[PDB]
Amino acid sequence: MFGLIGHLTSLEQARDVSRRMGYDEYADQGLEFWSSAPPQIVDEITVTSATGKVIHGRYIESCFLPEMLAARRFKTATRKVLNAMSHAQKHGIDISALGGFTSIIFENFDLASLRQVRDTTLEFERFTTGNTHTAYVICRQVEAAAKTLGIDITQATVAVVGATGDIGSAVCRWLDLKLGVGDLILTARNQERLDNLQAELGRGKILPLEAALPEADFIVWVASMPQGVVIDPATLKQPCVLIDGGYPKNLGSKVQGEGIYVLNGGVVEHCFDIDWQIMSAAEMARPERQMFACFAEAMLLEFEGWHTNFSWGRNQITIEKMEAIGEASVRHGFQPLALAI
Amino acid sequence: DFQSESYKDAYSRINAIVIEGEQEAFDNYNRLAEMLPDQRDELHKLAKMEQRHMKGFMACGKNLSVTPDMGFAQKFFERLHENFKAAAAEGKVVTCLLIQSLIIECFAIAAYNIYIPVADAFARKITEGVVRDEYLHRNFGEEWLKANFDASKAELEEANRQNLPLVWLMLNEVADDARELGMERESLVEDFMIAYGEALENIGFTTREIMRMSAYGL
Ligand SMILES: *C(=O)CCCCCCCCCCCCCCCCC
Ligand SMILES: CCCCCCCCCCCCCCCCO
Ligand SMILES: [Fe+2]
Ligand SMILES: [Fe+2]
């Protein structure tokens, strides 16, 4: 049994998705109610691999909302994640993806040292962040978008916004060693983490966001932003490819214009219909086929029988792990989401 | 953290609530023993194990130099007492079980869990003893109603509607009180909903049912 632990992107989305399912009690209430709400299994999932193997899974709603962080409800947010993980273990789920901000909260607030949740002791090998698969998928999306637009990736500039993060640092390593990208712009908040990533990569310029934007042919957005920034088209090159891998989306608005291509980063599409409701709630273009890559990782781990915390922690993702999850990804029938033309 | 000044004021009513709570539990379980003959022995066991908790919390009010306001605590439980006595008088055992082994137990589970990490060392040690018993009392109500689920469902839904809103009123009454002891209302609601939703799932309710039932009155 695999598990998917996620959360909604806003209170308005949470109230809308609740009302659209039968959950009217959650649709009528505000932040304080969500702050005390328990985790809930709200979807049963069956997936068939291209190899024919059938797996089963469950979606767990954590009831975390990004506004909790802006309202500084840091302890609330911590409980949402720990209660959701405890819920997965109590129900005997073998491997669960910590989607979206639940993995970020887990790391930023050192939740490893809080692993006793009521009568439960969390077993970290039953969880993955899914970040290895997300980093792999985003790299394939860069590669394919470049071929699709007639851009030579070895002659082009890629800016990685969030380059010090777990996903961002993996993408940088693969863009360097497997794609031979022309040049790499590293962008992030922590100077020391940037300095260290530049050393370990042996290349890349460090630039603030406002100076990275106008220089980039591709911008990979993998920043841990609760909110989403507003980018004016006029500041960007033409053509520019925005790969927005954030959840919530790093692009707080629709960036549309001449020579601007926006791609939902870290999304895969399956060769078979999947019977479930949660990707409709997530506004995938094809909600019966498409899903976030971190959730696909949990499916891959269950397909392969790799019941372990395959993606864990921060900055531990290696090229060989990305290659391994990527081969499993193709084999079981997943393909990276491509530019929509 | 002080264990000084207002903490004793607040602790007077809280300790009172827990004594009376454990008292109401002793009685409710005795009357259930009459109401269910074929488990009269088993119920009498849980009932006695409750008096032991009451002694334990008497002790907690002792070595912290607190005198518990037994009047306040009796007003605190009046409605649920009133609802219990009337249901038992009418022979409605399904409703009695929900009040005592589901609602009141999960109230205690939530309260004590939240209390332990902010308790002084002595009360914390004792509190940690009781909390695991309460989970076992919960499981008695759980397993009975689970055996008689089809026959009991409608009355459970009715008793949830009649009594769960009292929990919310009670948590509001005692809120800022409980804050002085270092315990947040938000965490109390969550722990209650977690433990109550759990018992309901074991009993047979589905997720949308539990979500409707657990939030009723909130
Ligand atoms: C992975 O890489 C990022 C994953 C992001 C998290 C995706 C969560 C999708 C939302 C699922 C839909 C929620 C529906 C249940 C709402 C229930 C409310 C009571
Ligand atoms: C202990 C402080 C918690 C604050 C919440 C109010 C006091 C506790 C609620 C009442 C608990 C009653 C439990 C009685 C025994 C149930 O088996
Ligand atoms: Fe008790
Ligand atoms: Fe009890």
Author numbering:
A (entry chain A): 1 to 341
B (entry chain B): 11 to 228
Which sentences did the original study use to describe this structure?
The earlier discovery of the pathway responsible for alkane biosynthesis in cyanobacteria allowed the conversion from solar energy to alkanes through photosynthesis, without providing external carbon sources. AAR catalyzes the first step of this pathway, reducing the substrate fatty acyl-ACP/fatty acyl-coenzyme A (acyl-CoA) into the corresponding aldehyde in a NADPH-dependent manner. Subsequently, ADO catalyzes the conversion of fatty aldehyde into alk(a/e)ne with one carbon shorter (Cn-1 hydrocarbon) and the formate as a C1-derived form.
In our AARthioester–ADO structure solved at 2.18 Å resolution, we observed a long tube-shaped electron density, which can be well fitted with a stearic chain, within an interior tunnel of AAR. No electron density corresponding to the CoA moiety was observed, despite the incubation of stearoyl-CoA with AAR prior to crystallization. This finding indicates that the acyl-enzyme intermediate was spontaneously formed, and the CoA moiety had already been released. The structure showed that the C1 atom of the stearoyl chain (stearoyl-C1) had formed a covalent thioester bond with the hydrosulfide group of C294 (C294-SH). In the AARthioester–ADO structure, the stearic chain is buried inside a hydrophobic tunnel (acyl-tunnel) formed mainly by non-polar residues from the NTD and CTD of AAR. One end of the acyl-tunnel connects with the wide cleft above C294, forming an L-shaped, long channel. At the other end, the acyl-tunnel can be seen to extend toward the AAR–ADO interface with its opening surrounded by residues Y23 and Y26 from the NTD of AAR and sealed by M221 of ADO. In the AARapo structure, this acyl-tunnel is broken by the side chains of M279 and M21. Both M279 and M21 undergo significant conformational changes in the AARthioester–ADO structure, where they participate in forming the acyl-tunnel. While helix 7 of ADO interacts with the NTD of AAR, the acidic residues of this helix form strong electrostatic interactions with the basic residues from the long helical region (R73–H91), as well as R118 from Fr-II of AAR.
